[PDB]
Structure formats: structure tokens, C-alpha cells
Amino acid sequence: MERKRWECPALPQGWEREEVPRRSGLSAGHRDVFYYSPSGKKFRSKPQLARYLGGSMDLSTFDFRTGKMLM
DNA sequence: GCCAGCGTTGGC
DNA sequence: GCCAACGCTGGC
């Protein structure tokens, strides 16, 4: 349960994926997933992400939780 | 019963 | 006033 962040190969150049495990409360150990644009904007849901990227690329099979396209 | 999506807010 | 961190909940 450590924070990890680096490049997401399923998104365009400069986009990054991050996992932050929750450390307390009822949801402790749960891992939230975020994405960061090249400009550093923080995304925490697929609808949010799709408003920035959904025109420039196909996101219909992108799995926000895993960060990969569903084959 | 799980979890995507997002509401809430203590601590700053 | 912001926002990381966690809870809530509608849809499945």
C-alpha cells in the first residue's frame, strides 16, 4: 500500500496515472485512482477525463480503474 | 453487496 | 477558499 505515479501508456504523451491507498477509516486500504494531464490537471473520474480526451481519442473501452484499454 | 462517481469538510 | 482524504449512494 504505497503511492505510485507515472506515465499511462493508454493515454496520450505526458499523461500520468496514480494510485493512492487510503490509510484510515472504513475504506482503509482502498486505492483511489487519479490521472494527470501534461498541464498537471487532476482527474478522478472517467466522465471528467472524457470531457478532455473524448474528442481526441477513443475512450469507450478505457478502464479508468486499471488504466488500460479493454481488449 | 460492490463500486463508479462524486459530495463533503477538517485542517490548512 | 482550497483540496486530500474519506464517506455516501444510485445503478448494477
Quick structural gist:
The protein has 71 residues and is mainly β. It has a single domain, classed as Methyl-cpg-binding Protein 2, Chain A. It is built from 1 helix and 6 strands.
Give structural attributes.
DNA-binding; about 70 residues; about 10% helix; 6 strands; transcription/dna; 4-stranded antiparallel β-sheet; Methyl-cpg-binding Protein 2, Chain A; Structural Genomics Consortium; two-stranded antiparallel sheet; monomer; Methyl-CpG-binding domain protein 3; 1 helix; mainly beta
Describe this structure in words.
- The chain is mainly beta.
- It has a single domain (1-71), classed as Methyl-cpg-binding Protein 2, Chain A.
- Helix content is 11%, strand content 31%.
- It is built from one helix and six strands; from the N terminus they run E-E-E-E-H-E-E.
- It has one helix at residues 46-53, and strands spanning 4-7, 16-21, 31-36, 42-43, 62-63, 68-69.
- Strands 1-2-3-4 form a four-stranded antiparallel sheet.
- The structure holds a DNA duplex (12 and 12 nucleotides).
- It is found in: Nucleus; Chromosome.
- Residues 1-71 form the MBD domain.
